[PDB]
Specification:
This is part of a larger assembly, with chains A (389 residues) and B (221 residues).
Chain A (H helix, E strand, L loop, with lengths): L15 E7 L2 H4 L6 E10 L4 E11 L17 E6 L10 E5 L2 E6 L4 E7 L6 E6 L2 E7 L7 E2 L10 E9 L5 E9 L2 E7 L11 E5 L2 E5 L10 E6 L4 E6 L35 E2 L6 E4 L7 E7 L13 E11 L3 E5 L10 E10 L9 E11 L19
Antiparallel strand pairs in A: 1-24, 2-3, 3-4, 4-5, 6-7, 7-8, 8-9, 10-11, 11-12, 12-13, 14-15, 15-16, 16-17, 18-19, 19-20, 20-21, 22-23, 23-24
Chain B lengths: L2 E4 L3 E3 L5 E8 L8 E7 L3 E8 L6 E3 L7 E6 L4 E6 L8 E8 L7 E4 L3 E5 L8 E5 L10 E11 L5 E4 L8 E3 L3 E3 L2 E11 L9 E6 L4 E6 L5
Parallel strand pairs in B: 2-11
Antiparallel strand pairs in B: 1-3, 3-8, 4-5, 4-9, 5-6, 7-8, 9-10, 9-11, 12-13, 13-17, 14-18, 15-17, 16-17, 18-19
Classes of the chains: A mainly beta (389), B mainly beta (221).
Bound molecules: a molecule of 6 linked components (NAG-NAG-BMA-MAN-MAN-MAN), 2-acetamido-2-deoxy-beta-D-glucopyranose (NAG) (2 copies) and calcium ion (CA).
Family (chain A): Belongs to the glycosyl hydrolase 34 family.
Keywords (chain A): Calcium, Disulfide bond, Glycoprotein, Glycosidase, Host cell membrane, Host membrane, Hydrolase, Membrane, Metal-binding, Signal-anchor, Transmembrane, Transmembrane helix, Virion
GO molecular function (chain A): exo-alpha-sialidase activity; metal ion binding
Chain lengths: 389, 221
């Protein structure tokens, strides 16, 4: 398309999910040249949807994959490769260098942001149209981070949530509103949310909704709802007792709309939700202590009701298999009356639970909604840690 | 809700094989694999491995790769432990535990335990003796009296005073093994109004030898 995108539709009814994309990265990367990645996501241009992830500068099999448990180094880069290919050395494309990213297409071209540097002197440079436009230095000197899933734009404005400061406390979260890679405005986190990490966002009907991570005290997730037209936001938590961070305490009967739900402290996992009244689905790990399994539950009015319990559900990865990061994306340039809600799950593999190998890496499963009620299967990464020995 | 009920305790002479069952209740078998833990008499708790009740693949702890084999009657929600070519130092209790997650890092919900006693000793039925006092009022208007269940193999033995209707002031001591067999006793303290007037009986079942004895503690004073 050659004109800015405007979020003029609402979600479609979510009555089950169907597979959209599957990688099989780690099973193929046992013999081919696949790159070690982590923090995946998916994002669509008007033209194509592509898988996106943070790379580690080595292939699974090469000797340099030893040590990729580590989150940030100067050999990480945000790459892109076609939907359902593995992230190969030969078909990947680097969008920028850094260890935390977000990227989105405003309708005319795309914004990609990589953050880089030492933990006390990190920088973000915002690439607009494969050229570096603006950069932002750190403001609280402690690991400036950002989304790890796509940003969303409305008429050229693309809000992006950044956090800088402790992960075990108060930190400094700001919402930036870029347009054509330039900073129109920015604001501090405002709302009842206590800490913000790795927001997963989608937009419909001119409003952007982000479901995030409270790493400091939450087991229920902060929601930030942004108005890209007035460039303002509010934050609250999901009211539902169906707790969705991980690790988590056991689900209560009454949740907490304005406060962290108490139980696990100083930990979390990136996660998403489609919050649309009765049409609300939530994703969560099946395990309470670990990144294993992944289910999607329909919990109507979960955002506002502190007694919301599931009414339909769907198993995406069995609890006997590993899951990991999850986030949302939508094909905004898909034809039709409404938007088809989609999500991805990161399937982490390697260190530290499967320490027999010295790499950590992952693969991708993505699903998108249907209105049919479709049968469910589960979707394992699939590799045998024993053939890499 | 969740019950993992295990088989009863066996005796086996060195060299034999044993299959210990774990029947699961309350959850969907398939979404939660099984941890097998060995709590050895002195030593404490040890992870023996985990079985993926979905695919069926077992992980063994290195200490357990070899004579140990996990399997499952999927169909009946049973997981099983099989220890082949039993070594004498395998006497201990084995617990199946449900593993909360992939790999079983968390055992939420444990079974009762199945205790194995590897031993070439032959099963012996007990001797139950009514131990009635040559008085000496054991505390103000209280008479203590007892039961000595001597010479049986293997343990357990079930000692109740009067069908378990007598629960207060019973002390049943742990059995002790003197070379080949066990000696166990239990005191019960009643008031002087309750005995010899009421009938106190010590009921002893040794199910290994199909003994069930009822010894009335006769006044004999
Ligand atoms: C063909 O495919 C169709 C479509 O997939 C199949 O039909 C679907 O089948 C699904 C499975 O039966 C069914 O999902 C279930 O829907 C009910 C609504 O009636 C929903 O409550 C279920 O969700 C709970 O149970 C699952 C496991 O069954 C849990 O993993 C999940 O977390 C939910 O339970 C937990 O949270 C609840 C809310 O707090 C608690 O009430 C509950 O106690 C439990 O809490 C514990 O677990 C948590 C972690 O697991 C933990 O944090 C917490 O602290 C507690 O410890 C489930 O979604 C679909 O609705 C159904 N769909 C359709 C369209 O019919 C069909 O089976 C297939 N057919 C064949 C022949 O194979
Ligand atoms: C996009 O939306 C804004 C208001 O949200 C409107 O003023 C603008 O003209 C729209 N442009 C296009 C190309 O849809
Ligand atoms: C990498 O792996 C080797 C074994 O492959 C290990 O001994 C070593 O400490 C690891 N770390 C580095 C930096 O080599
Ligand atoms: Ca949390």
């Amino acid at each position: 398309i050659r004109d800015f995108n405007n979020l003029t539709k609402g979600l479609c009814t979510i009555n089950s999910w169907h597979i959209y994309g599957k990688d099989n990265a780690v099973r193929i990367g046992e013999d081919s040249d696949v790159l070690v990645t982590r923090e995946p996501y998916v994002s669509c241009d008007p033209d194509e949807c592509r898988f996106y992830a943070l790379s580690q500068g080595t292939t699974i099999r090469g000797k340099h994959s030893n040590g990729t448990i580590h989150d940030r180094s100067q050999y990480r880069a945000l790459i892109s490769w076609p939907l359902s290919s593995p992230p190969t050395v030969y078909n990947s494309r680097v969008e920028c260098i850094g260890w935390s990213s977000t990227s989105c297409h405003d309708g005319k071209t795309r914004m990609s942001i990589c953050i880089s540097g030492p933990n006390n002197n990190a920088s973000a440079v915002i690439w607009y149209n494969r050229r570096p436009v603006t950069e932002i230095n750190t403001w609280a000197r402690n690991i400036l981070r950002t989304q790890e899933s796509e940003c969303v734009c409305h008429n050229g404005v693309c809000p992006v949530v950044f956090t800088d400061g402790s992960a075990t406390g108060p930190a400094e979260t700001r919402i930036y509103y870029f347009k054509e890679g330039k900073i129109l405005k920015w604001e501090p986190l405002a709302g009842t949310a206590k800490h913000i990490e790795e927001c997963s966002c989608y937009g419909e009907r001119a409003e952007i909704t982000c479901t995030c991570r409270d790493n400091w005290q939450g087991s229920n997730r902060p929601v930030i709802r942004i108005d890209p037209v007035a460039m303002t936001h509010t934050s609250q938590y999901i009211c539902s007792p169906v707790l969705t961070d991980n690790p988590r305490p056991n689900d209560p009967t009454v949740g907490k709309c304005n406060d962290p739900y108490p139980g696990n402290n100083n930990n979390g996992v990136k996660g998403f939700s489609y919050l649309d009244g009765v049409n609300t689905w939530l994703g969560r790990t099946i395990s309470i202590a670990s990144r294993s399994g992944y289910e999607m539950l329909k919990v109507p009015n979960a955002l506002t009701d502190d007694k919301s319990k599931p009414t339909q559900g769907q198993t995406i990865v069995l609890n006997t298999d590993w899951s990991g990061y999850s986030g949302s994306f939508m094909d905004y340039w898909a034809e039709g009356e409404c938007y088809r809600a989609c999500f991805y799950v990161e399937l982490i593999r390697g260190r530290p639970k499967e320490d027999k190998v010295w790499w950590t890496s992952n693969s991708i499963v993505s699903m998108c909604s249907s209105t049919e009620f479709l049968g469910q299967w589960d979707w394992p990464d699939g590799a045998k840690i024993e053939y890499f020995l | 809700q969740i019950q993992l009920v295990q088989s009863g305790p066996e005796l086996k002479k060195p060299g034999e094989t044993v299959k210990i069952s774990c029947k699961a209740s309350g959850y969907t078998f398939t979404n939660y694999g099984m941890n097998w833990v060995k709590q050895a008499p002195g030593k404490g708790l040890k992870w023996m491995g985990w079985i993926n009740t979905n695919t069926g693949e077992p992980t063994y702890g290195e200490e357990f790769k070899g004579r140990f084999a996990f399997s499952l009657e999927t169909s009946a929600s049973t997981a099983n432990l099989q220890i082949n070519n039993l070594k004498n130092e395998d006497t201990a209790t084995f617990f199946c535990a449900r593993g909360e997650d992939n790999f079983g890092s968390l055992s939420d919900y444990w079974g009762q335990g199945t205790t194995v006693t590897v031993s070439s000793a032959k099963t012996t039925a007990p001797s139950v003796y009514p131990l009635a006092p040559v008085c000496g009022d054991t505390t103000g208007s209280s008479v203590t009296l007892g039961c000595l269940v001597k010479g049986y193999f293997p343990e357990p033995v079930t000692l109740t005073w009067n069908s378990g209707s007598l629960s207060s002031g019973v002390h049943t001591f742990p059995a002790v093994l003197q070379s080949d067999l066990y000696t166990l006793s239990s005191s019960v303290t009643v008031t002087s109004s309750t005995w010899p007037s009421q009938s106190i009986t010590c009921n002893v079942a040794h199910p290994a030898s199909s003994t069930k004895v009822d010894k009335k503690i006769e006044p004999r004073g």
